[PDB]
Design a protein around this ligand. Structure first.
Ligand SMILES: C1N2CN3CN1CP(C2)C3
Ligand SMILES: C1N2CN3CN1CP(C2)C3
Ligand SMILES: C1N2CN3CN1CP(C2)C3
Ligand SMILES: Cc1ccc(C(C)C)cc1
Ligand SMILES: Cc1ccc(C(C)C)cc1
Ligand SMILES: Cc1ccc(C(C)C)cc1
Ligand SMILES: [Mg+2]
Ligand SMILES: [Ru+3]
Ligand SMILES: [Ru+3]
Ligand SMILES: [Ru+3]
Lengths: 97, 106, 87, 95, 95, 106, 97, 82
DNA sequence: ATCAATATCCACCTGCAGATACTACCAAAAGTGTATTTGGAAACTGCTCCATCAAAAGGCATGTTCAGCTGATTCAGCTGAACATGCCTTTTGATGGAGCAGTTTCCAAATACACTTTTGGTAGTATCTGCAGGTGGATATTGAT
DNA sequence: ATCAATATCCACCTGCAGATACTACCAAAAGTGTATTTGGAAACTGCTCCATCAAAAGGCATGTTCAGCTGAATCAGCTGAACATGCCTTTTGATGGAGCAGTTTCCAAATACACTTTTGGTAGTATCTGCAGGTGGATATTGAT
């Protein structure tokens, strides 16, 4: 019977993910979400497959950068745990509101 | 029978750059030096990035520059990082970077 | 064409583990349980803004297909320029 | 089968100059191509505005030069200005 | 000596329709002028971009309309669009 | 002779707007309705701000609109505030606003 | 023998200053700082009167707004006192760092 | 009484600006921090403005030179022309 | 609670900075009539690649467990707020002179047009090679003890 | 520290994807040359409005005092990490057509050029007024007790 202490695998994963460049969201799920949002704007649309890839690259880079900012807001508050209020602080300072 | 590129000592294409300037409606008229000067700046910047990207490829024991190397190049260089501060390189990933307080012990 | 499957609740294909990964790449060590819904919300807003603009370029061109270029131009408008897809 | 142009071969020539044994993936090339287009448009844009602000109908190497100093940060601007000046001087004398 | 143009009087004409008893300071007028110039530039700029993306030599009201949608927030866009289409209808029918 | 503004029922100069588009290098050519449309949009938006700035003048017991009235007008309206979100109105000040945690205890 | 509590005058000023629109830095000090900085870029420079004003309008609007974000950053960390780290967090998230 | 110009941006004036920004309590170290931030802001904008001046072959920084510098730095200002 | 120091409120008055009003004016746009050039919808059709179906590769959902993080409580001590005004720096106003802006000039350089050549793209069919993804095998890191 | 469970790091290999290659060709380029148009530097110069400075105004540097904030110490409760476990969903590879995108004809529309009419910026002189800044006294707020 064996166990890593909480935080050990987490750090392992940080090093792993910061090392690679592959998209971290599953392709089909992400694609359904795009098609749904678009359909709500306009019916009977097609997407070139690189259009979807573009969005996905853009969305993952947006979300990763937002998490670094969020992480900095948590750390500022003397925590190591990101919370919805950290994200909200980031987005307000970023002028997304 | 000489191109304006060889005349200016440039790899980048002065004719092309002249053409693109005209159709972009940046002004009524385009001076003869403008595409020359612009093609050189473009050449300069692309040499700068390829140098640095080449090194990142080499540091990874790779012979082929891929988007991760371009990202290492740009983000590790203060000035290219700023010039491209609002740009995203598809398939570039991020810089390894873990905030101190996150590490184990004291 | 006969029949055209209903799309609903797809926001949920953005799973807990996928969001954890993005946090990791972003250097996050510990993640409160409420982050996941908050992230879905934020992602959805980001996507609507870019899709709206993308679809607008598509319609202006009188097309039915959203191009890589429609997206790239929408990304540029919103100050999130993308390299890798023709722009 | 319409002809789609790119800076690919020029990027490749310049790549050979600086790293003669190094290759470039097509994706990396795509990004290189986007980067040149991007910088091009940004300098042309600044030059455009600049001319207008000064009630000029012509974009000359003088306009490009100021656009470079406005657009680029410190050391990249200094060096880019050298190279472009060098190219124009050499261009003028070469006929 | 040279004539310095301004939207100042048209802004002033519109003020009167909207608030016939209300005046405006110089500084406020200058702001209003900036506003029109700024929005002018944002709209023309986006329109130019559109025409270029679609390999067209002309900026038509279709380009201005799409520009307006892209640039204005929701409700402001809709009304602006309806004021725009309105002005073109009225203009055409008029001899 | 009758002005294109009056034809289109507008206080905003269709003629000038037409000219400014030409000598702006926005495109090689300019359709007949684009200035009409564009001028209407500008008139519209002007009126919107003038109305709300008027109302702001009223509130503060004034008949003369000043920059402060334009600032209160723009930042108290969600849509105008978003459009001018990266804009500074000279001599506008800010909206009275104090974070509640900073208020003294009852 | 009458003394206001810490923060009373602080609140009073916030209300006063959020109501007015005058520039809150003295014109002269600001003008010298402008010319000084300009000197490193070109010598023998003159400035229009409205040029210096424009610069003052912009610098105060910038600084006022940054104090808003900074104040949010102090509050996030459960304080009511702005510190250099709060300005630093704000600037970092704004992408000025 | 020899003194840097940056120090002409005094404690009370920085305190006023904070106040308009809704700030109640202020750490002692804020004042030097703020001056730093202000100097970087002016450098960036002035650098760009002067660059417009030099281009126009003038020796006077015009309000328009400043207004254009502000626009490109993403800080559009209204009320001084353009 | 009460009492009093001081800030805040409203009303009314007043001089003038800064607003609206005005006519000449003339000059420069904007609009009107004639001839020229050009763009892009519509009609048509090759053909890329998008949507939509079945089989294989591995990531997701869920329950359990307890480590250690968060957030409450308390508290000592440090640090920033408030305070009074003579004192020194900024503001207001007075006046030469730099330079910016208006104007005219003329030519080097740019647009235009018309053969003339070169080249950058693709396409067809081939030909080479960096490295991703598999294996096993030797060394670090981690956590119990 | 000692032991050991598990991750990590090499090294070496091998198919094959995707990259470099090449031979044919060509349309759209870029180049060359000669003719005609003009933008903007260049030079003189007129008048703002900018730097400078004396006198008048008034905001701030000072140090002392202590309220109340920040941050360290301590702790219980419980959230969120780790991991085992069962299997559903995505990924990968191979077959039909909507629509994109490339060619051409043709007029509806924008350009151009010159002409003739008015509008809008300025300046001139004067013309007018909304309100910032001051008074007075009534009432609210804050803080001591
Ligand atoms: C929040 N709400 C309003 N709009 C923006 N975001 C996402 P949806 C719901 C459209
Ligand atoms: C709010 N409502 C009334 N009017 C103003 N705005 C936008 P629409 C609906 C017209
Ligand atoms: C119509 N439009 C123009 N103005 C008058 N009315 C009401 P709002 C919109 C201001
Ligand atoms: C909540 C919600 C969900 C979808 C939309 C789309 C139509 C933009 C808007 C709000
Ligand atoms: C966009 C919109 C919203 C509301 C109205 C009202 C007048 C019904 C109109 C347009
Ligand atoms: C059409 C309309 C009428 C009033 C307003 C203001 C008063 C909110 C805006 C648009
Ligand atoms: Mg739907
Ligand atoms: Ru929604
Ligand atoms: Ru409406
Ligand atoms: Ru309205």
């Amino acid at each position: 019977p064996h166990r890593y202490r909480p935080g050990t695998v987490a750090l392992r994963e940080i090093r792993r993910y910061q090392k690679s460049t592959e998209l971290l969201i599953r392709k089909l799920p992400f694609q359904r979400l795009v098609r749904e949002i678009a359909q709500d704007f306009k019916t009977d649309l097609r997407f070139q497959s690189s259009a979807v890839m573009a969005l996905q690259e853009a969305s993952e880079a947006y979300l990763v950068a937002l998490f670094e900012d969020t992480n900095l807001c948590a750390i500022h508050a003397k925590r190591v745990t990101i919370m919805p209020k950290d994200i909200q602080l980031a987005r307000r300072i970023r002028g997304e509101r | 029978a000489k191109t304006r590129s060889s005349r200016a000592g440039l790899q980048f294409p002065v004719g092309r750059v002249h053409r693109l300037l005209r159709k972009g409606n940046y002004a009524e008229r385009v001076g003869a030096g403008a595409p020359v000067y612009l093609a050189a700046v473009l050449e300069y910047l692309t040499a700068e990035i390829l140098e640095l990207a080449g090194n990142a490829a080499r540091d990874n024991k790779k012979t082929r520059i891929i988007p991760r190397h371009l990202q290492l190049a740009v983000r590790n260089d203060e000035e290219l990082n700023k010039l491209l501060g609002r740009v995203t390189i598809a398939q570039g990933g991020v810089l390894p970077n873990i905030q101190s307080v996150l590490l184990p012990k004291k | 064409k006969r029949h055209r499957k209903v799309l609903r609740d797809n926001i949920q294909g953005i799973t807990k583990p996928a969001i954890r990964r993005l946090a990791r790449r972003g250097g996050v060590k510990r993640i409160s349980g409420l982050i996941y819904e908050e992230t879905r919300g934020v992602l959805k807003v980001f996507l609507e803004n870019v899709i709206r603009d993308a679809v607008t370029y598509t319609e202006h061109a009188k097309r039915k297909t959203v191009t890589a270029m429609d997206v790239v131009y929408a990304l540029k408008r919103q100050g999130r320029t993308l390299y890798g897809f023709g722009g | 089968k319409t002809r789609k142009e790119s800076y690919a071969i020029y990027v490749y020539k310049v790549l050979k100059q600086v790293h003669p044994d190094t290759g470039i993936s097509s994706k990396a090339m795509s990004i290189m191509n986007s980067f040149v287009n991007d910088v091009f448009e940004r300098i042309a844009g600044e030059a455009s505005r600049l001319a207008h602000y000064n009630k000029r109908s012509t974009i000359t190497s003088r306009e490009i030069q100021t656009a470079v100093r406005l657009l680029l940060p410190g050391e990249l601007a200094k060096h880019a200005v050298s190279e472009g000046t060098k190219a124009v001087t050499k261009y003028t004398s070469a006929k």
